[model samples]
Target chain A: TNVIALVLSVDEELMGFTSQMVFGITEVLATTQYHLVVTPHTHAKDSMVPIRYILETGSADGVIISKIEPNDPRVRFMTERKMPFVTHGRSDMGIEHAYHDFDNEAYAYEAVERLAQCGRKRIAIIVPPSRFAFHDHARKGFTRGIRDFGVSEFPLDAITIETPLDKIRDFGKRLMQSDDRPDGIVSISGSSTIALVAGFEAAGVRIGKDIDIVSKQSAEFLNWIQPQIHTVNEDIKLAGRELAKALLARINGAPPETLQSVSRPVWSSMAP
Target chain B: GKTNVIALVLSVDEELMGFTSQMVFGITEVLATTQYHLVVTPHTHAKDSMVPIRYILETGSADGVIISKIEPNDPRVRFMTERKMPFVTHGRSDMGIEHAYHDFDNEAYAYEAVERLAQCGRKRIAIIVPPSRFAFHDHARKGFTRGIRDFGVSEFPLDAITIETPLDKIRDFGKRLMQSDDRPDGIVSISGSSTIALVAGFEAAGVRIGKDIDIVSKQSAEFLNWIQPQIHTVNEDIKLAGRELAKALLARINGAPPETLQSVSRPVWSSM
Candidate 1:
């Protein structure tokens, strides 16, 4: 009766955040009777299969999920079924639910402002695939920041964060070779930033000189990059802690709206 | 009372995303073909790791168990054996106990890493190993020592760090190592997470990768290449380990002999 289930994609590339989130989840879970059972799926299409099984079987007392979409059926199904749950990402499905989300819009906005202040006239932001709910939020912040900071937007549509590492590297090289290459880039994750850095290095583009990058990282590995890149900390551990707390609250008969929370970016470094 | 659940007890370090997430994916792939559901029990404190496993068994919450971060004389392994519990370990133990396990050939990986670095004309080599407490740590150091002797290369001492050292401290150590009078011409990193900090430190000291020095590292994820393709890398297929561990544990639960349920995987070298 004290079981909790986490439904998320088990992606090695995204483990930078996943592991930390789990760390926080387990940290809070240690003091309680609740145990964690992770149901891992590969894509958005199969995201609901595990959730359906858990709900149908009544295997878990509460549930937690990530990689939320704007019109998430998982949220809809859970809400209708009255299963106690909390999402790591929010949805806009015209229904209120418990969630703990990082402020990507603010992250995008501040990154652009930082780039502009550092004398970057044209800025570009790497985004997640369109299927994710955060993509729109990030895009909105990027556009808003561009307008507010008066910096021109350099569109990069060929590659998203979902692109393969090798392909991303190739894209980085081509982007640098382009005459209209943006002097400032905002990266979504530390893994993609590494690929982009590799591409820039191959093109003989000097990091922090020919072009500067500001990345959102859940881990501190970013600070070790040579000629160190600017970085914003996402505090994924905190997200995990909040999400677990929200789900536990929901299970205890708390209101969904009251359990909602958002994490702001902590500027770890602004290396030019 | 037969729950279709398998418990996995392991470390929840955020830095372990490279290993943890991939391993879980591998196990889930195997579990998908069966009715078994995976329950992840993460432990942060190394000393109190047995608490979760003990809880799982005492509560009869799971049918079988899989554990990792194995020590040479692991108490968990001994306890599970004494209890006649069906289980498998990700790494082997040295307590003269014959039990189910799926381990990487870290000894071979260290040996091969040294061979590659030596072939690159590296006269002095250094290795960054894991904490001395892990079974794999001893295996790696043994292989490293044998490599230096067999290849007639001098050992460059690095006493300030291990794979478990904090990233910032590792970075500082790397810088000091590079700036020292007799720094290694070649470096062998046992884990990808630590390699990131080590390389950053080297670069901070104004040393260049693939040119001023050579490095060969073992990575479970496709990331080291993205970081610096010039560095040679060996792939430790974590997904395969996961798949193997799952199969072994299930087989054990089905009354298979522990001695027959063991495997050691070979390391695959990636292209430069």
Candidate 2:
């Protein structure tokens, strides 16, 4: 019902899409009563440092930001002050505050389960670098899945969202070329899946019969391209709704634990 | 002089991660030495890309633009040309226009890779090429087929082995090829960014790369070089391509000759 700061990350390609969604969610969740103060950032620290200034000066009643990393100090800053805010993503630094994020751990766990049920062993996970919060959770789920299904864990391959397809292809190639290559792969990112699939295929590996794959991706991406593979699809609009609902309650003095929210992925398998 | 702004619309979630990021670095590198300031607008949806492009053009948000993945006879080219807007494409749209662009010698390198692979005293060599969707797919297929015919290698029909399938399928195909009785001794892959699938496929099928089978790839990054005696490659300098696009578009804004703005660069060979 009050004005809140929506500092958007201009660094990502989905900025405009995410921005409009937040605006629309705020309008619906707040009955069109709240005002959104928009701020765009050129750099991460520059975007974060100004949050303190915005809060202290009463520029808004709450804050919401995406692109949450593993060791973000800003979350702690908000927690110490008991400020009303909700993060679009979570962190692994053990700083527990009100936030809305996908249950990425379970997401990957389910991905591995899909591969395991298909009679695959020697599973590999193409994980994101530990720099991002989701990486820790996804890895947690994948490792758990590996143990649960009696799947052998080879050394995991680490990649960034910025890794090119060709580079990932090479990464995939090296994985398969290892002394103990995987019979199944649970790639966390779509591009990584593409690269891994490409690398393995060029070497003459069969997809379904000789090997199996499961990937986590957006629904559109899952439908549009990814090869015949199991997938965990996330609903960003629902996340947006939950994020809007959680932040407003935080601003209104609700406890953090009571407002913690997590969205789970929908799993499906496609046969190309 | 007034400040000049350049805008580039990018999707950070796309499979080609290093592509846009590398291009941005190249563009900014040139911008640093000139009067231009770069503004990157992130867009996740492919269908909605033209919205921001038109907005920037109509509202004068940018002096120039560099668009990528232009389809042959793309309407954007005609729109930009009709408006006399300062813009350059990363690759040609094949509109039969004297447009400014920077394209790699896809044909030459395809031929070159085939020739490189043929020198290993191998008579039976398979070729991996792109599907029909891409503009380079046909050019690459022709050169590869030509090499197959001229070099007197294996008599495998191009239609049977020529594939643009997803990563898993290709890897599956590779595995099958290696396991078959008529398995080729050498391979030329057009999908340089995705050599891992091929390598993985080969290894999985019990063929040793470099020893049992040889490969020639065209790479855009330094990744393939890390593997010793596995892949010989030709480089596509994305950063240089970025700089070329930026400089050409800037010159266009300053009324430079379209003929002078058009340039092409050859690939550098690397064997590890």
Candidate 3:
């Protein structure tokens, strides 16, 4: 009896999330009394163009959105407009809006823990910019990890996720050349890891030998990038289920007060 | 008599990420009942190089191999078959190498996809096939051309429009085509997964799908069917494909006649 739209953001990070949400919601809500309208939004500076256009044009009932910033405008837009919407990641304002989050903090923590265990005294993290809400949690977790693991020789190095491949290679070169260079690195995404690996090899830093790398990548990416780069599963599939359930509950009215949800990852050391 | 290893080879192309996951699941499920251990061959596009597969064969590391994206008279096919090694192909070959293969009827799939597009009044149709080296490319070409002939669009420029492209290259090609005044109304994606790029390019060119354009795609998975519209598809079950290939290989290893193991899978029209 409700029309739910899932907006596939043009943002690269959301590609897998879009595909996973496709199956996740369809399978979970197959018997539900709701209609799901999924569409790809190539670019959204207004951040709500596709969602607004499709829902209004199609007379949609609610929506599911991704790449949520701390004070996500779209979430506010939807909620203020009295249209039910659920987010794929957390909002920084920590408001009462519904959300399903990746345990970005937890996974980042485990990655650092593993790198520390691998006998790497220095650790670095490559992260997305502040525009992404999860980066805050990721940074917090990374910070906690280095301090907890006693990686005291060198402070955590910060790398932006948007570093171009050539620049990343150069970045890897400069980082490794320093006397206090990190012997372990954690890349927030697989795209960054690929570039880092290229950069490392260019600098003659042997992966799984001279330095250990921990990457948080999708399971499919893990299968291919594994054997040298240790990883933690990024469960976008779980987000699909939780997002759907959260939105449906909101539609029913008097949804649970605790609409915030988080998912954990399985630790896998691909380094052999 | 002990645990036999089955090597599944994947190309390094990032586009195959979704297809590979489902295929791995199928292979894993079937092998769970057998004594076979699945070893995914390290990812690479150079199936012709054969360094990894060669090592697998020479060292007897794997009792059987499952290979896909077959080419006509593929050197790998000849080498594996001439040596009397147990192997199965995911697509047919035209090199007169008659070995066991589990293949889709892409020729028929393309024809039907085009016919359905024609019903939507999309006469000026363009078909996207992978590089001609891939066996299915020729089949897709044949089906597309033959279908147009029957529909009285006999003068369709199959040669000009039937471009063989890889995933990375399809979007640019799509943009150029869509930007042209005589751009075809319908596009047939035989590679199936490359539709991602096509959609991107279409949006870049301001070509709205489902209204200004319609497409027929060969889908290897169900994600596209549920989440996408304005695209008709003939579904190729990559999971079932993996299952069939594994079954064929087991038979080959157990001494089943090559012809007996050869099987053809038809593409079913994907229903929303």
Candidate 4:
């Protein structure tokens, strides 16, 4: 029964991200006696159901979960059960726990500033669905960034991070054609950036020329897009390694406070 | 320890490789109802990734193993088979040894792509594939070579890039290829990632997708529809591959013959 279970959402959109994290977890795990069993839920709302089964059956020695909520009931559930676990994100449930998270608040703030530094007056941003915990962090940072940079945000509510690429592309083309089009854009994910670029290009706008695009890229492929895109790097594999190590430490009776870790954004070119 | 564990030995870097999460989901879906738990072992080094598999075998850490990225004479397959340990590979080998495997019919996919392009008035065809270290590479290459000859299309040498080439370089290569005197009229891309950059480069050079040059690609996800609906695509069900691999490994563990456990999935066309 020397097993550690990782609970995650297996959305097709997050397939690449999920695999990299699993790789990091396995790397640390191969060195230890414990084996890893991943429990994937289809949606974030259903994440807690699997954790319940894992705990009820005592199927694993420890657990790892992501997509943390502000008042995560899973955190409380595991804590009450005395299960050794670590979350990929933090909880604001007034309960201390082991976690490894990227500083999304800082990433969003820097992204807006980076766009503003390039002589852009107004900014437009694409963020994750509001249901995610990091959405608030990123939004807060973006709000603060716009305030500090003295830039107004364009109201573009039709397209979101979860919007289909065709719709996003259409929105981009329409946004560019409109009189209220922002000169600068901040995209939080690489997948969405693909559609955004295509849409902007379709409207006869050249990236890094007529418009400045700043994005957080998880994959290295974004660098190859015609006309350069300013990027911030999110090292997911590093996060995976940290999360696994933290979970192991937690299982080994290390204090939760000592096991907590946060990674700052690594800009591809610009400095904060 | 009679671990009742099925360990997946894979490369963790999806940037340079292919889908990891979808395959894991397929495997997890099958193993969920079984007593065997899934343990994913990550290898940072792709070429010489036998260390993790060897360690697993030596320690008896798992009851069965799953390995991907099969070479013509993979050491992992050889070592695991010699030890009488139950295992399955995601791709087939050319070693003349019987083993459990679940593979996409890449050769067929490439041939069909070439034929389709030729039928659509494409005179010269080029293909982008994985490196030659993989067994599927030879399969795809052979198919493309034969298809061009049979379909009476001119050859466009693919010396510039494989799937492993950096995105920017591939984009650069794509631009050069289109602008050259011997520009291809049709291209066969085996990866969705490379297609993104290749198309970007083509667009940069003012080459239209459907009108000037046509592309037939294999995509594991649905984003291709949004990227460019005009480009022809075939869907490779990685999740199905995962399910088949898990089922085959379970059968092998239960004393099923390796030959009987082998399977190959044909390409599923999205649309012409």
- Clash tally for model 2: 23
What's chain A's TM-score in each predicted model?
0.96, 0.80, 0.86, 0.94
**What is the per-residue lDDT of model 1 for residues B86-144, given as tens digits with 9 covering 90 to 100?**
88999989999989999999999999888888899999998998889989999999999
Error of 3 at B71 (Å): 1.5
lDDT of candidate 2 at residue B88, scale 0 to 100: 88
DockQ of 3: 0.02
Cα-based lDDT at residue B132, candidate 2: 67
**In candidate 1 chain B, where is summed lDDT lowest over 10 consecutive residues?**
B12-21
The per-model DockQ list reads 0.62, 0.04, 0.02, 0.47
lDDT of 4 by residue, B75-181 (tens): 88899889988999999988988999999999999999999999899998889989889999999999999898999997787887998788778888998887888
- Residue pairs in collision within model 1: none
Instruction: Provide the TM-score of chain B versus the true chain B for each model in turn.
Output: 0.97, 0.85, 0.89, 0.96
**Per-residue lDDT of candidate 2, residues B1-272 (tens digit):** 24356766553333321343455657766876765656555445557657667776687666787777566676767788887778888776777766678777677777777677778777776666654654667666777778777777763544554444465566677788778887777777765534656676677777877789888877665445433236887778877998999889988888997778987777678744
Give TM per candidate.
0.96, 0.56, 0.52, 0.87
Candidate 2 regions off by >4 Å? A1-272, B1-5, B9-20, B28-62, B71-74, B93-96, B145-155, B160-164, B225-229
- Model 3 clashing-pair count: 1
User: Highest lDDT: which candidate?
Assistant: 1
The 10 consecutive residues of candidate 3 chain B with the worst lDDT sum are B155-164
lDDT ranking, best first = 1, 4, 3, 2
Off by over 4 Å in 1: A11-15, A270-272, B13-17
